[PDB]
């Protein structure tokens, strides 16, 4: 009963950390059972007590509502560390959404780190003690971070009202405060210009401002780079708004354009911190929550984005919930998140019991909770969730302060708003009675591409953006629409993101755009699609298209490995190498025997020879190991093999300097890639069931090798790089030559010379073409049959090598011809009926017996060795 004793000990120590070190019937039953266990199954009684003690757990969970989002096990693990002050700041990103870790100096809270690691200077320190509970100092930290955000907002407003330049303030305060300060300064200057009829002076001022910010962006390294481009997106938005107002003919048109765009305001009469800044869109008023959200990317301020923002403002003015529906890829959830990050609130994204819990948490904290793919729910859970959201909404319009959900008294926040997006391919009646549906159109990708290229500083922006969007539209129109063909906004943003690593060696201009567009789009197409892509790239782009070392190492590795350097093989190898140079997540697509394992092994060996880096290969198949064997289940805890190799590469000196490569050489099941959804993106963190966050080295490159993509989501196609094998990368004689080299490695010179001389391509091509017209049971290609033909021939020669030194050359040639004929008969057409075997004999004889063989040696027959068996009746 070792496992039972371990479980009882774990239960005892966990409940000690919960209640024994802290201070009726349930506690008395626990103390009696603990005394009985110490004197001496009680584990089931302890589980029943924990089920009965969930009401106290729920009360403690509802004491501070930030902790409500986490599960029961994570919450009790957090609560159990009530004196050690450990693990609280490690896995707290689930309750805040944008804060990863907390730094503490001299047992006092003084800083907060964002989702990427942005260090923030808190205004007031927080005392820490073992008697202080987690909820109290968590609330203190929340109040402190809100106060710090507000006082940095005040400092930014003071320094901008003092007339100081912005290049000295962009590098020391938080991005939210300078965001609000820039927006307030812009709306004040444009309103003071709206009291008159001039716009040129502040337009030139903001033009010089965006020039200075572009120069600082070119001089910034990483964090300042992200901050400056995030500010520079809305600085181009301000320039666009002022330029649009410049061309207005009358006062009424200028007033329309100014009321349509977002306007920012603050109140100089009130004294409260969290409710002193309000934004106004098309007349209505929304209050700024003053919450830290880290430094996420800013959506490019499309006019349709402002239309959608006006739609959410109209929906939230009367406490209605905004609703979106339209084709996938138009950016609906990104629009909702942009509204949240612009107005200053984190939005808890739902990937739609647990849904009801997240719903009541988001309606009891007052933050916003959005939805995605609302139509994929099962009917019962859809009805329950719809009833829950409609009843909390009906509580919201009615002005109720508390609502009863799941037989608990949950207070209703006066700031809760819930949004739902749809992907039709609909909204129920109860929800449509209380929502405001809006239809997102196709977003203007030209404006997005132009502004993104203006961040990247390319010398041609508008013409380049128009050219690339027209080129993507023409590829969408003029290609075979298969499952994995995406030519919309996601691939455009991927190409514009992948243009960054090539600009330092290729220079800013059109050629970097052409090179990255090739390296992204070209390796995911077929053959006629490749021809159409090449023709369109030559026609629409001026650039029509120093790699001696990598190609030479590739040729050397392929020649020493026995492979042949076919031109399609060389092209596919170069595309794979240039595509793994930047993108980490790659898949391999192609039929059986297309040359995928060979091409990645060739490029890995060439890379090891060229760069000098060590390579460790972990081949694995997805479908031969179950879910628990690959990841790990809670019985105690057992580690899966993938988690085992991550554990031995993270916890481990050789692995740091070595590139560990893992390949998943099987079909892409949706479950395993859904479990891989947390590492294929930019997060790069395994989500273990127990909550362990195993790190991943940047050299850990994931690969997939799958023939069929009918059972894979299009999101994985967009997120991970796709390599396509439309044609075989080998000639047939390459297959025979590599197979012969491998078999020789597994009068010998005369024997191999005669073996090589027995294979002539001019007649082999004709006999293969003739044999391809035969009927094969469980039919496979001849390209897949030479694999056993060559091995059978070499094994027969190696078996008969013992008596190959006392016969003439003509007899040896006859033996060679007979054995090659036997191998070709038994492998190429050795899977058909005997009548078709006789037809094969006639065809191969007219192009150059049925049971002819060699019997120990002479050209004997099988008819002289059959035994007439003697059988008895029983």
């Amino acid at each position: 009963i070792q496992v039972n004793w371990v479980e009882v000990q774990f239960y005892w120590l966990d409940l000690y950390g919960i209640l024994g070190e802290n201070l009726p019937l349930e506690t008395s039953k626990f103390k009696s059972l603990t005394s009985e266990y110490k004197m001496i199954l009680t584990i089931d009684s302890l589980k029943m007590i924990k089920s009965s003690l969930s009401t106290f757990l729920e009360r403690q969970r509802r004491q501070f509502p930030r902790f409500y989002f986490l599960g029961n096990d994570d919450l009790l693990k957090i609560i159990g560390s009530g004196k050690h002050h450990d693990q609280v700041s490690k896995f707290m990103k689930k309750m805040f959404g944008s804060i990863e870790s907390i730094i503490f100096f001299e047992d006092s809270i003084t800083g907060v780190r964002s989702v990427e690691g942005e260090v923030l200077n808190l205004n007031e320190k927080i005392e820490l003690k073992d008697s202080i509970q987690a909820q109290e100092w968590l609330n203190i930290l929340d109040t402190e971070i809100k106060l710090s955000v507000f006082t940095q907002f005040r400092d930014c407003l003071g320094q901008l009202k003092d007339g100081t330049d912005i290049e000295v303030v962009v590098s020391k305060y938080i991005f939210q405060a300078i965001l609000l300060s820039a927006q307030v300064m812009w709306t004040e200057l444009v309103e003071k210009c709206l009291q008159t009829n001039e716009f040129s002076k502040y337009w030139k001022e903001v033009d010089m401002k965006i020039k200075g910010l572009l120069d600082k962006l070119n001089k910034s390294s990483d964090n300042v780079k992200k901050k400056i481009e995030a500010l520079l997106v809305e600085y181009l938005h301000f320039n666009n708004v002022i330029g649009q107002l410049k061309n207005c003919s009358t006062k009424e048109e200028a007033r329309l354009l100014w009321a349509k765009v977002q306007k920012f305001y603050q109140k100089n009469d009130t004294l409260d911190d969290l409710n002193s800044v309000f934004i106004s869109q098309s007349g209505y008023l929304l209050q700024y929550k003053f919450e830290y959200i880290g430094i996420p990317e800013r959506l490019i301020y499309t006019p349709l984005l402002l239309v959608g923002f006006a739609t959410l403002t109209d929906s939230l003015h009367q406490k209605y919930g905004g609703c979106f529906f339209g084709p996938a890829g138009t950016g609906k959830t990104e629009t909702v998140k942009a509204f949240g990050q612009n107005l200053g609130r984190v939005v808890v994204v739902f990937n739609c019991q647990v849904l009801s819990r997240l719903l009541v948490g988001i309606t009891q904290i007052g933050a916003w909770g959005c939805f995605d793919e609302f139509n994929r729910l099962d009917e019962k859970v859809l009805s329950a969730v719809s009833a829950n959201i409609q009843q909390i909404q009906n509580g919201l319009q009615v002005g109720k302060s508390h609502i009863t959900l799941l037989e608990e008294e949950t207070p209703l926040s006066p700031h809760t708003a819930v949004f739902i997006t749809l992907n039709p391919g609909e909204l129920p009646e109860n929800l449509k009675k209380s929502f405001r549906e809006f239809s997102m159109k196709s977003p203007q990708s030209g404006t997005i591409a132009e502004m993104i290229l203006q961040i990247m500083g390319f010398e041609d922006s508008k013409s380049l953006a128009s050219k690339i969007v027209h080129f993507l539209e023409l590829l969408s129109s003029k290609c075979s629409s298969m499952n994995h063909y995406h030519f919309g906004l996601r691939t455009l943003k991927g190409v514009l993101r992948n243009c960054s690593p090539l600009v330092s060696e290729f220079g800013e201009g059109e050629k970097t755009v052409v090179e990255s567009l090739k390296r992204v789009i070209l390796p995911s197409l077929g053959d006629t699609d490749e021809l159409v892509f090449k023709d369109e790239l030559s026609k629409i782009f001026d650039s029509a298209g120093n790699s001696k070392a990598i190609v030479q190492c590739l040729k050397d590795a392929g020649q020493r490995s026995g492979f042949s350097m076919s031109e399609e093989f060389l092209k596919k190898c170069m595309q794979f190498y240039y595509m793994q140079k930047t993108q980490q997540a790659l898949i391999l697509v192609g039929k059986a025997g297309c040359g995928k394992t060979a091409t990645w092994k060739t490029v890995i060996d060439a890379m090891a020879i060229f760069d000098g880096h060590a390579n460790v290969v972990y081949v694995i198949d997805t479908k031969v190991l179950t879910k628990e064997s690959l990841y790990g289940s809670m019985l105690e805890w057992r580690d899966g093999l993938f988690t085992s190799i991550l554990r031995r590469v993270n916890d481990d000196g050789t692995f740091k300097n070595s590139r560990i490569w893992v390949v998943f050489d099987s079909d892409l099941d949706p479950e395993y890639v859904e479990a891989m959804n947390s590492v294929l993106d930019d997060n790069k963190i395994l989500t273990l069931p127990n909550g362990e966050r195993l790190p991943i080295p940047p050299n850990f490159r994931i690969l997939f090798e799958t023939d069929n993509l009918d059972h894979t989501t299009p999101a994985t196609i967009t997120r991970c790089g796709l390599l396509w094998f439309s044609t075989d990368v080998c000639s047939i004689s390459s297959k025979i030559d590599h197979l012969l080299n491998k078999s020789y490695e597994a009068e010998l010179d005369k024997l191999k010379d005669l073996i090589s001389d027995s294979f002539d391509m001019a007649s082999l091509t004709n006999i293969f073409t003739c044999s391809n017209d035969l009927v094969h049971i469980l039919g496979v290609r001849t390209f897949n049959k030479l694999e056993t033909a060559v091995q059978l021939a070499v094994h027969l020669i190696s078996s008969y090598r013992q008596w190959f030194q006392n016969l003439d050359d003509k007899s040896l040639k006859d033996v060679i011809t007979l054995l090659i004929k036997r191998s070709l008969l038994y492998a190429l057409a050795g899977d058909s009926t005997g009548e078709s075997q006789r037809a094969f004999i006639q065809t191969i004889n007219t192009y150059f017996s049925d049971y002819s063989t060699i019997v120990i040696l002479s050209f004997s027959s099988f008819c002289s060795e059959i035994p007439s068996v003697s059988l008895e009746a029983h």
Partner: protein
């Protein structure tokens, strides 16, 4: 033959099913209700009239017309001669754009020829109802001549029968209890209300059970002689499928919408009460715009691209936006361009996806919300701009007068909607072609 045709009607749609016992009770109603030189022809004609007068109300307008004219066709197949059949089939073929021919010359056929050569399909097709059938039953006649107490008045979208139900409740001297459905507290409230009213009496209305089909399946099937107790289960024709045993045990009633546009404006203005003069003027203009866009909504193949549903939430949103625009303006100068863009884009053009309907709505807003001195929203009425030296009450009186002054002509759908008449003629021709094709499909089998 009639029950076979009604069986095809039942297999067409989930709400158009008919029971055998309903047919037998309707046939007994023929003898309950108390000549062609005999008695059996009188019994047959009274059978046809009674089955029309009873089972017309369980269909919408198009199925009412096809069933009426199919019953007329069977009766005239039985009674009249071969040349009569040839003429009737010729008109059915020319109404379906299948066979073109001339009648083989009964002045009723002459009026039918004069109707169809004038391209008046609606009158030539209501000729059957106006000639053959002399009795028609409304909802009051159904509720006054039904021993069953459970009613399923399922009305299609944009058509609301609750007002007529409560008006009939006053007419029957009874207070209805409107019950919303969807929330569990309202589920328990509805259960308590029906438990009280099933023993104490009193009418009760159940509405919007579309999200509560789960509760309906779990409760009403197990749930199914008290005076003045008649519960109504208001459903929707375009909604999800009601349970079949519940439909077999309940009467089926379909409601029809008001054909006018002026009455919609009058109802919206009566439902609106309050706030300056310009706010009242904007509310009046917005009510006219909402009635115009709701009228143009129903013309599906020509007026718009597809069916839409502009309920009262959009009217409330637009009214609140107009109130906020007029209130937050200290210059008392209404920015008509901004409110035009916001009405055509966000409020009413929100759920509209394709660009042509958005352009249609923007054109309608430009025609209505222009805010000129001479505002001719329709050719019938002229609206002058309000003055400054008055109050709200005399403006309310003037606007009530200018609603009472105008009248709705018969060509309102072509004149008040700014739509060409040839599109209306093609829409009516397509409707006549569809109903003639379906009735010839029913007649050939």
């Amino acid at each position: 033959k009639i029950f076979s045709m009604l069986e095809k009607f039942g297999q067409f749609h989930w709400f158009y099913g008919i029971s055998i016992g309903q047919f037998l009770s309707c046939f007994k109603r023929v003898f309950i209700k108390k000549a062609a030189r005999t008695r059996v022809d009188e019994i047959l004609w009274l059978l046809y009239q009674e089955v029309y007068c009873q089972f017309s109300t369980a269909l919408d307008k198009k199925f009412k017309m096809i069933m009426a004219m199919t019953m007329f066709c069977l009766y005239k197949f039985d009674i009249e001669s071969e040349q009569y059949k040839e003429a009737v089939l010729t008109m059915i073929g020319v109404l379906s754009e299948s066979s073109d021919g001339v009648p083989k010359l009964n002045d009723d056929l002459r009026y039918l020829w004069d109707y169809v050569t004038t391209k008046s399909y609606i009158s030539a097709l209501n000729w059957f109802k106006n000639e053959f059938f002399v009795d028609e039953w409304n909802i009051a006649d159904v509720v006054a001549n039904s021993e069953n107490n459970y009613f399923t008045m399922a009305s299609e979208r944009d058509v609301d029968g609750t007002f007529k139900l409560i008006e009939l409740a006053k007419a029957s001297k009874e207070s209805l209890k409107i019950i919303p459905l969807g929330s569990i507290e309202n589920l328990n409230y509805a259960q308590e209300e029906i438990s009280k009213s099933k023993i104490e009496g009193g009418w009760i209305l159940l509405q919007n059970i579309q999200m509560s089909l789960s509760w309906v399946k779990t409760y009403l099937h197990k749930h199914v002689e008290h005076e003045k107790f008649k519960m109504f289960m208001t459903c929707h024709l375009t909604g999800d499928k009601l349970p079949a045993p519940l439909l077999q045990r309940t009467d089926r009633v379909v409601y029809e919408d008001i054909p006018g546009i002026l009455d919609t404006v009058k109802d919206l203005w009566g439902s609106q009460f309050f706030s300056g003069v310009w706010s009242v003027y904007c509310t009046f203009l917005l009510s006219w715009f909402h009635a115009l866009i709701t009228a143009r909504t129903r013309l599906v193949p020509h007026g718009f691209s597809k069916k839409y549903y502009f309920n009262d939430c959009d009217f409330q949103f637009a009214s609140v936006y107009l109130e906020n625009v007029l209130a937050t303006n200290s210059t008392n100068n209404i920015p008509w361009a901004q409110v035009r863009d916001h009405i055509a884009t966000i409020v009413y053009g929100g759920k509209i996806d394709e660009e042509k309907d958005l352009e249609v709505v923007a054109k309608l807003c430009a025609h209505v919300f222009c805010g000129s001195d001479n505002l001719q929203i329709v050719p019938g009425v002229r609206i002058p701009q309000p003055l400054l030296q008055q109050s709200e009450e005399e403006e309310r009186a003037r606007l009530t007068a200018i609603l009472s002054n105008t009248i709705e002509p018969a060509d309102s759908l072509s004149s008040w909607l700014q739509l060409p008449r040839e599109s209306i003629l093609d829409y009516e021709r397509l409707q006549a072609k569809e109903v003639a094709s379906s009735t010839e499909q029913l007649l050939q089998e």
